Design a protein around this nucleic acid. Structure first.
Length: 78
DNA sequence: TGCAAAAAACGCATATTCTCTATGCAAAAAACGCATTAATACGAGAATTTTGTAGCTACTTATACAAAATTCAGGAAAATTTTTCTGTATAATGGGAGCTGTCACGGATGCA
C-alpha cells in the first residue's frame, strides 16, 4: 500500500555497478555531449535544426550506427 | 329647727344737677367776580429752496483670440534592493507509528 516502498521495491536492490563504468560511461558522457552539441551547433548555424539524423553528428555517422552511439550512450547516463 | 319679728336697710315719696342735646356767633377759608396783562395763536410776505426731470459724461463692463507664465502625465534612463539561477568535489548504501475494547448492516468476494 505504498509507492515509497515501491521505491524500495524495486530499486533498493539497484546497485552502483561500481565506479569502473565511469570511464565506459565517460566515452558516452562525451559522446552524447557531442552528438547533440554538434546537432545544436547546427540548429544554431542554420535551419534551427533540419530535424535530420546525420546533422545529429557533425562528423559522418551511418544512421543505425550512430543510433547505436545514442541509446547506448543514453542507457549509459540512464 | 318650725318663726315671730326687729332694726336697719331697701325700696316709693322729690330735690339737685349735671352730662347733656340744643342755636346763634364769628372768623377766616374760598371762590367768584372785576378785571388786567400777556401770551398763544392767526395774517401777510416773499425767501429759501428741496425735489423732480433732462441730457451729457465718465466709469464700468460684455465679450472674443488664444498660448500668458505654470501644472502635470507619461517615457525612459538610473539605483539599489531583491530574486532566480548556477555553482562550490573524502565517505557517507532499504522508513517510522500507530491499529488491536463498538454495534449492526450489506454486499463482495475467497475457498474449499
Amino acid at each position: 500500500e505504498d509507492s515509497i516502498r515501491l521505491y524500495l521495491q524495486e530499486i533498493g536492490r539497484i546497485r552502483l555497478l561500481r565506479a569502473d563504468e565511469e570511464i565506459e560511461l565517460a566515452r558516452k558522457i562525451a559522446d552524447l555531449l557531442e552528438l547533440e552539441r554538434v546537432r545544436e551547433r547546427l540548429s544554431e548555424k542554420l535551419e534551427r535544426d533540419p530535424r535530420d539524423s546525420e546533422w545529429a553528428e557533425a562528423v559522418q555517422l551511418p544512421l543505425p550506427a550512430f543510433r547505436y552511439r545514442l541509446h547506448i550512450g543514453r542507457r549509459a547516463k540512464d
